[PDB]
Amino acid sequence: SFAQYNQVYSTDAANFEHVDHYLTAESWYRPKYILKDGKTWTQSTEKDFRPLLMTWWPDQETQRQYVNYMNAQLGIHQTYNTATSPLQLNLAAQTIQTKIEEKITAEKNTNWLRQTISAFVKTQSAWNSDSEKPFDDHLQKGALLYSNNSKLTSQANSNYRILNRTPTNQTGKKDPRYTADRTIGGYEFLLANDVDNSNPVVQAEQLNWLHFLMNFGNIYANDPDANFDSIRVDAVDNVDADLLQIAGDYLKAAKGIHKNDKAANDHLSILEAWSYNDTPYLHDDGDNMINMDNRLRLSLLYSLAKPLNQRSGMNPLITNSLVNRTDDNAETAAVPSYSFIRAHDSEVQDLIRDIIKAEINPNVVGYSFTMEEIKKAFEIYNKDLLATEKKYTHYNTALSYALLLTNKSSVPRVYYGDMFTDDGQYMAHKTINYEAIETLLKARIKYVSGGQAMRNQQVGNSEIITSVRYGKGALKATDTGDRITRTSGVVVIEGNNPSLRLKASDRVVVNMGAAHKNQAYRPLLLTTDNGIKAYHSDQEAAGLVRYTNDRGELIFTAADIKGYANPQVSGYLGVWVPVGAAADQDVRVAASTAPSTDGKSVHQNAALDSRVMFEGFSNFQAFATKKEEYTNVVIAKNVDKFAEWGVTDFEMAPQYVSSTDGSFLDSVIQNGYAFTDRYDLGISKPNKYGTADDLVKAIKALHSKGIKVMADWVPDQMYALPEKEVVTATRVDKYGTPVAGSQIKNTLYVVDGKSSGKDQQAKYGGAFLEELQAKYPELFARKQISTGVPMDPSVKIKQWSAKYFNGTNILGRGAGYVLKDQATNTYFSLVSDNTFLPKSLVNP
Ligand SMILES: [Ca+2]
């Protein structure tokens, strides 16, 4: 009869390991007595906690499963089938308790018991991911949505959790103005703990953090020179779009970006917003930041980079873009944008997924790779980059960069991993395209200016495109300009088919513009049998001069243009520049301080086009071995290169210390997107890129060359929060819709949902709001679109908890982990006025 001894020492909450006054399958508790060393019933002390599952079970079948399991762990030989009597099971459990206590004494610890109990727990369906099925296509197989109104978990109640309020669906109804993306333009649950960005208190906290990032130097190091200048908005299509008005309002109120282009261009901030509706929405919102040109990205991808037999026609390079470049003669383009072909995730982690799925692990889930899978995949990927026939990696990267780097009316963004290997130490190894890219970047400072014309010509058995910049001061082909128009401008010629052959009578006649009659040109880049040859000066290309005729036309023939197939080129690339630019010729233009008057902040004119963004990291960089390999230490050492390349905006990796849970790629390669503490920029320990002091130094080094530095602002989610919390939860898909056939619907669930209360969030959270409301009261007077109300700065978030989150990815804890009385279907509880405990533990 152990029931008397094992009864609870008392009903005080302090006697149990509870979470918000609920018990869980893994809760331990203090009994009245302990069977010391298996032999002597002895009054417990405060240290004498033991698992609830040693003395209590939720039903007879769970007691059987516990006995059979613990017998196997403890070398007790008997197993019990379903016909076993209640008596046999109770005796067996008491025998088990006996052995447990001999073993606690012999081994001087209870950690072993912690481990066997937790392992037992995970064998039960009600306590593992089996009761969290069916799964759905969320990246981590499912989400849990926290209930707004629940008497069981009133501390996690909310009046908000307004979901899927993307730019397209900001008002809860698809916007009728934007029709190129017919969906609702994104979805609320992406990864990990999903932050409730419709909560006005959470919105003020995202503004606090934005302000922190943009005064990072002032706040952390007292150095007005180590501040981030601009931001990237991460995962726009997964958060409430009110944040876009908040960040734009902040840029305007704090930095004056709406006053003149000099101010806007010193703080040029971008969105990562993939819906086609996001660009026109951002334009109507005031061009307070710029978005990607996703159409053009797709055209470069399918016209140039795809496997030969999947490759489209070339005309989309001209017309399938935010800007039709057939004839782009505008002083200011209709909408600003940035343009890229690959980014740290886009067309990098997808290709690693393709490799693993095809050759290594065919059941890999989403991008939840292991480090071992990644390393094996890189063996296959790095070979493929060097081959002429590529199975998995991009073709024609140089052709894509020649268009990106000469196009008018978009800021190009160069991806770090197109110049340096995607894996390996920062900047330690150059790709085979590094030299072609660097030559384009340097020629771009010197030659790329004026209006643009693109032509598509069908020739021989295929087609080419030609792309011309007329030179600084000539927006149209008829403009004559002056001396510097004459020595600037560029022509790019491309084909995308290696069997391209011209007839003997074919000509590609290219109008260079009226500044360029009767003139010597020389090659910048030519395709060759094995690669691409780069010419770094007029002299280096001295045997290869050609001329324009009376009319300002260069004319090309079969002798110049044919299709090749080599590691760099599948098709054709030729680029020519006018002879005789001075060594330091620079055709870029600085922004004006004249006041803006069109109601837009950022303007796609010659000053914005003079800019180049560099996305300065790869997800798959190796981990540093020593101080000198840290990314931020290496950026500071090589700041001269970025300036030589004309980089004007350096997009650094998010700098938050990474969590290490491994539940998704970001927290396996620790890029900085999966983090527990938003304000921990290499402060508590190094991030992947160095210490907070290395970050300070890289930002100062970039500033000493006039280069602006972008903070990646990541409001969508947080990972691996250290403290447990009980919520009332429903299994939902990535939009928040309840999953059909699930067992978890308004049922209690223990999430990892609170931050420590003692980290950088606790020090800075809400710390600037008083100052922000004094200096910029207009930020706080907007009534935000999704909620209809202003931000609410009256509460500081020093500790995150479930009330500020929409939900979480499913955790594999099971539908029944919070314990219940099966007889009455009522949760056990330790709240003092309302205590409800297993009867056999309080009244044996
Ligand atoms: Ca979200």
UniProtKB/Swiss-Prot annotation:
Please name the GO terms of the biological process aspect recorded for this protein, alphabetically.
Answer: glucan biosynthetic process
Explain what the record says happens when changing Y276D.
In strain: MT4245 and MT4251
Molecular functions (GO terms)? dextransucrase activity; glucosyltransferase activity
Record carries keyword Repeat: yes
Q: What class of enzyme is it?
A: transferase
Q: Does the keyword Signal apply?
A: yes
Enzyme Commission no = 2.4.1.5
Main location (coarse class): secreted
Q: Which reaction does it catalyse?
A: [(1->6)-alpha-D-glucosyl](n) + sucrose = [(1->6)-alpha-D-glucosyl](n+1) + D-fructose
A cellular component term from Gene Ontology for this protein is:
extracellular region
Outcome recorded upon mutating R295K: In strain: MT4245 and MT4251
Chain residue ranges for the region called Catalytic: 7-807
**Family, per the entry?**
Belongs to the glycosyl hydrolase 70 family.
Additional observations = GTF-I synthesizes water-insoluble glucans (alpha 1,3-linked glucose and some 1,6 linkages), GTF-S synthesizes water-soluble glucans (alpha 1,6-glucose). GTF-SI synthesizes both forms of glucans.
What does this gene product do?
Answer: Production of extracellular glucans, that are thought to play a key role in the development of the dental plaque because of their ability to adhere to smooth surfaces and mediate the aggregation of bacterial cells and food debris.
Report what the protein is called.
Glucosyltransferase-SI
List the source organism.
Streptococcus mutans serotype c (strain ATCC 700610 / UA159)
Task: Please give the range of the full-length protein represented by this chain.
Answer: 244 to 1087 of 1455
